[PDB]
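Bumping my old thread because nobody answered last time. Still need a sequence for this structure:
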């Protein structure tokens, strides 16, 4: 890797857990259990190489359409993940955050995530950001409602709204936009993930199923990224 060109923010759509379990004739939930474990491997190598922000698409606002047993299983995984992995996150100076409407989660999931946010609040290393009950359209609808009330309550009209103002009112207001979006499994679509924020992101559509995505594969993705020529509408 070119150590002077490590992306500051990588966003990942963790797809393929269902297919990984079906290949093995195991229930879909087994693939999610293995996919929650794979998050630990990726957090480790992202922190070690000096990625500043890692946003993981854990559950979207459309994923409520899935069978309730699968929804409840995914919603409970964070409790398991933080129970075993929080000590290492503290030690590795990782700061845990979320984006999404995290109020709709099971109480025990809220408590486990809040405890992890509080225990890592002053950490200055990798920001590990879980997008849980998150969708880019719903994020915009919510930010729009906030902006409409803030402007009226400040005695402002809408002439002050520009792209920068919207950036500062999204759930990602404290993060830069990701340079790189990786999606596993093969699919080639963004499925409502960070739709405003990925306007100029590089995409990589990696063919491994999420539970098979490992350190080596993350490094190969960053190497691919470093070969991309980004133009932002201009000439190279
Ligand atoms: C955030 C946290 C600490 C733990 C939660 C971690 C996990 C595993 C969340 C499930 C992630 C999802 C919805 C993956 C889509 S794989 P898919 O079901 O779409 O697979 P398929 O397309 O059917 O192969
Ligand atoms: Mg899928």
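Sorry it took so long. Here it is:
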């Amino acid at each position: 890797l070119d150590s002077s060109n490590i992306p500051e923010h990588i966003a990942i759509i963790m797809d393929g857990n269902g297919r990984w379990a079906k290949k093995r004739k195991m229930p879909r939930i087994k693939g999610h259990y293995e996919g929650m474990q794979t998050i630990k491997k990726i957090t480790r190598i992202a922190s070690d190489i000096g990625v500043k922000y890692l946003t993981l698409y854990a559950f979207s606002t459309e994923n409520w359409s899935r069978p309730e047993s699968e929804v409840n299983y995914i919603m409970n995984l964070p409790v398991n993940f933080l129970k075993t992995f929080l000590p290492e996150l503290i030690e590795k100076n990782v700061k845990v955050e979320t984006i999404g409407f995290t109020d709709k989660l099971p109480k025990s999931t809220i408590e486990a995530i809040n405890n992890a946010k509080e225990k890592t609040a002053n950490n200055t290393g990798l920001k590990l950001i879980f997008a849980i009950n998150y969708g880019g359209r719903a994020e915009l609808v919510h930010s729009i409602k906030n902006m409409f009330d803030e402007l009226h309550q400040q005695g402002l009209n809408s002439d002050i709204i520009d792209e920068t103002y919207i950036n500062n009112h999204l759930m990602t207001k404290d993060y830069p936009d990701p340079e790189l979006l990786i999606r596993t499994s093969g699919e080639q679509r963004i499925s409502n993930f960070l739709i405003w924020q990925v306007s100029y992101s590089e995409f990589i559509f990696n063919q491994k199923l999420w539970p098979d995505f490992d350190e080596d594969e993350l490094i190969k993705c960053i190497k691919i990224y470093q070969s991309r020529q980004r133009r932002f509408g201009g000439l190279s």
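Residues 14-19, 32, 35-36, 39, 58-59, 63, 74, 77-78, 81, 130, 132, 185, 210 surround FPS (ligand 1) (CB under 6 Å). Let me know if any region looks off to you.
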